Structure 1
Amino acid sequence: TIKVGINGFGRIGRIVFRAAQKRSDIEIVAINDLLDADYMAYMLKYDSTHGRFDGTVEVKDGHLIVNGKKIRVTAERDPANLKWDEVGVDVVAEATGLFLTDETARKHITAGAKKVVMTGPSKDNTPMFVKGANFDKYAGQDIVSNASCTTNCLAPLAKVINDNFGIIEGLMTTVHATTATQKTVDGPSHKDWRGGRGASQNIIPSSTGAAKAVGKVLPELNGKLTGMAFRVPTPNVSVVDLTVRLEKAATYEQIKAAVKAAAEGEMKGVLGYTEDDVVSTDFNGEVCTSVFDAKAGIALNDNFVKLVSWYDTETGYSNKVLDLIAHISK
């Protein structure tokens, strides 16, 4: 099995942890964070979105004992002191959101780890990979990024559409679920004034680099897509609204056929397909990073269409982080 260490036991670190429990190829052996082992156990045990942890969690001697397995807990603010080698860590899931560059993440390799997977878009030229889009381009680099949740949703769909009909250009809008960075009531958000306004009372316009980032995982689409976001008061599921101009004329039925074929073929487990009258909550706990909603989309004509795809911002992304870890471990 692959031994993983999680740096940063936040929303993502915890979902990566919970998802890993259902996997036999990956095993989390250590967790690092500036929180008390007792507090971490509580946040693992109870979750307003994902429900109670299905298993046993006890704190003994400052460490966590999850389902019997002892998990080393530390509180190092500096990655270089993590001593991952003492616990035999192969890959480190970097989830603090603070070390998104090579020289910072590299510290884990200095601390004993062999490879690092950033659970967010790298801030430098560190390569990003998205399952269904470019895992095959992986060339053995020791530090890698899993891009973002929106890019993970957009990339697979954009690939199927482009491969079959050719995307001339497209604009995306993601109706985004409330994040941890937003506020409960009108408060300060210096770099993002709109973002500081009460999340529960508002539809908040926001900018996103997720659409442009698709160009990095799918070079052939570089410069052909961009978009924005609207932050809404929902808890977990977001939706991508992609308006595209096709090179090859295609009826909506042909578009549905192409997506469905991919969902049951080369992108099974990545891209999902549905024709049901679904709503956001129906995807809470969804592992597919992109679920094509056939009935929600609409076409003006054979070359201008609006496609809709759902994604659980935490569950889908987190499972793919594990997929990348497995992939880079050969």
Structure 2
Amino acid sequence: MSKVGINGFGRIGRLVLRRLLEVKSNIDVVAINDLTSPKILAYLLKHDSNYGPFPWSVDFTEDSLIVDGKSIAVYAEKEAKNIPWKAKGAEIIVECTGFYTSAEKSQAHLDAGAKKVLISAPAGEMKTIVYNVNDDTLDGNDTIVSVASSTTNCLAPMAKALHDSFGIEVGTMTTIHAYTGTQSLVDGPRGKDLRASRAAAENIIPHTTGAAKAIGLVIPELSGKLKGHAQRVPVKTGSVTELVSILGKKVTAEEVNNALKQATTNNESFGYTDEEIVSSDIIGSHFGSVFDATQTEITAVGDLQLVKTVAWYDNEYGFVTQLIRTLEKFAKL
């Protein structure tokens, strides 16, 4: 129950291991499952187009990685129920494949002899945790838990702060979001999301996301009160979420900013800036969300007020630092 396996050694999977080693975690990654050879997983861990060289040694054998001198078994089981997690005693699986985003599906890791699963994505009605918003809802008896999306991790601490300070009566969100591997390099079939079939680095691409709609799992009072969507655009990582709200009180911009500032104080998960940053400045962030005071906008006509608030997020590494906080707590229950 400090021994971990990773299913899906992709962008998130590899950064999970990077982060665990960065914080000198007591968690022990003993096994990795993907679809490929150790050779290829080794090369991918060693060379990262977004974060540069792996800061530890990486080698491999025909069935393992050796990362900073320590051996990690590598399996290639496309069906999670066949992953031999018991061989090295992997107890908590960090599920990062995208193919097991529900209770029913991730049960397969427990049938395969793990005790717990932390899914790196929304997964329906199950405990969904944004760290430093609702991580106190985790419980010793939880075996399958979600950390939602990157987008949820960015939205939630902002929504929580506005909710606690002013009340959110209704709101809508748009994230301007880096492209991800669910999109396409060249125009071509991508299941049945038509917009996902289009070349991701050459287009602005609207895309659905549940971040707003499922916010009730993280902040129950906001349940049903938000909606939203993304526009996927050609940056490799680093994204930004705008929320437009009718609040429960009349406010000034200074007041909103000051409230947010207070909520980020002593908060390892939720950062604040008033610097004129742009997306690349978020890359490598150790926050799940960085509230940007410079973009706060209050639109007012007589009685009526609309409030736009904006937070940056590194949808890869930043979200990953959240996934790890949640994992470290999950392992100790």
**What TM-score does the superposition give when structure 1 sets the normalisation length?**
0.94
Q: Structure 1: which amino acid aligns with 2:49?
A: S
Shift of 1:61: 4.2
Alpha carbons 1:270, 1:289 under 8 Å: kept: yes
Pairing 1:199-218 to 2, within 5 Å after superposition: 199-218=200-219
Alpha carbons 2:32, 2:73 under 8 Å: kept: yes
Structure 1 SS opposite 2:199 = coil
Aligned-residue Cα RMSD (Å) equals 1.6
Shift of 1:110: 2.4
1:34 counterpart = 2:48: no
The CA distance in 2 between the partners of 1:186 and 1:108, in whole Å, is 35
Q: Cα 1:86–1:235, aligned 2, differ >3 Å: closer, same or farther? A: same
The CA distance in 1 between the partners of 2:29 and 2:326, in whole Å, is 15
Structure 2 SS opposite 1:85 = helix
Q: Which residue of 2 aligns with 1:182?
A: 183
Q: Cα 1:290–1:105, aligned 2, differ >3 Å: closer, same or farther? A: same
Name structure 2 gaps, 5 residues minimum. none
Q: Structure 2: which amino acid aligns with 1:68?
A: G
Alpha carbons 1:3, 1:89 under 8 Å: kept: yes
Q: Structure 2: which amino acid aligns with 1:272?
A: G
Q: Structure 1: which amino acid aligns with 2:325?
A: D
Alpha carbons 1:21, 1:27 under 8 Å: kept: no
Q: Which residue of 2 aligns with 1:87?
A: 88
Q: Cα 1:220–1:13, aligned 2, differ >3 Å: closer, same or farther? A: same
The CA distance in 1 between the partners of 2:39 and 2:199, in whole Å, is 31
The CA distance in 1 between the partners of 2:88 and 2:202, in whole Å, is 46
Structure 1 SS opposite 2:214 = helix
Alpha carbons 1:131, 1:324 under 8 Å: kept: yes
Q: Structure 1: which amino acid aligns with 2:78?
A: R
Structure 2 SS opposite 1:210 = coil
- Identical columns (%): 45
Shift of 1:239: 0.4
Alpha carbons 1:271, 1:288 under 8 Å: kept: yes
Alpha carbons 1:84, 1:112 under 8 Å: kept: yes
**What TM-score does the superposition give when structure 2 sets the normalisation length?**
0.94
Q: Which residue of 1 aligns with 2:282?
A: 283
Shift of 1:73: 1.2
The CA distance in 2 between the partners of 1:119 and 1:48, in whole Å, is 21
The CA distance in 2 between the partners of 1:246 and 1:103, in whole Å, is 38
Q: Cα 1:71–1:296, aligned 2, differ >3 Å: closer, same or farther? A: same
Q: Cα 1:74–1:49, aligned 2, differ >3 Å: closer, same or farther? A: same
Q: Which residue of 2 aligns with 1:326?
A: 328
- Map Cα deviations across residues 41-76 of structure 1 (whole Å, 9 max, x no partner): 000011111111111111124211111001111112
Alpha carbons 1:248, 1:303 under 8 Å: kept: no
Alpha carbons 1:154, 1:290 under 8 Å: kept: yes
1:309 counterpart = 2:311: yes
Q: Structure 2: which amino acid aligns with 1:137?
A: T
Pairing 1:127-276 to 2, within 5 Å after superposition: 127-139=127-139, 140-265=141-266, 268-276=267-275
Name structure 1 gaps, 5 residues minimum. none
Structure 1 SS opposite 2:307 = strand
Shift of 1:190: 4.6
The CA distance in 1 between the partners of 2:104 and 2:188, in whole Å, is 34
The CA distance in 2 between the partners of 1:189 and 1:71, in whole Å, is 33
The CA distance in 1 between the partners of 2:238 and 2:247, in whole Å, is 28
Q: Which residue of 1 aligns with 2:292?
A: 293
- Map Cα deviations across residues 116-162 of structure 1 (whole Å, 9 max, x no partner): 11111114x33211112211112331111111110111011100001
How many residue pairs get matched?
327
Alpha carbons 1:85, 1:113 under 8 Å: kept: yes
Q: Which segment drifts farther, 185-194 or 114-123?
A: 185-194
Q: Which segment drifts farther, 188-197 or 208-217?
A: 188-197
Q: Structure 1: which amino acid aligns with 2:312?
A: W
Q: Cα 1:28–1:199, aligned 2, differ >3 Å: closer, same or farther? A: same
Structure 2 SS opposite 1:282 = helix
Structure 2 SS opposite 1:262 = helix
- Map Cα deviations across residues 194-225 of structure 1 (whole Å, 9 max, x no partner): 22222222211222211111122111001111
The CA distance in 2 between the partners of 1:173 and 1:158, in whole Å, is 13
Q: Which residue of 2 aligns with 1:113?
A: 114
Q: Structure 2: which amino acid aligns with 1:171?
A: T
Q: Structure 2: which amino acid aligns with 1:281?
A: S
Structure 1 SS opposite 2:189 = coil
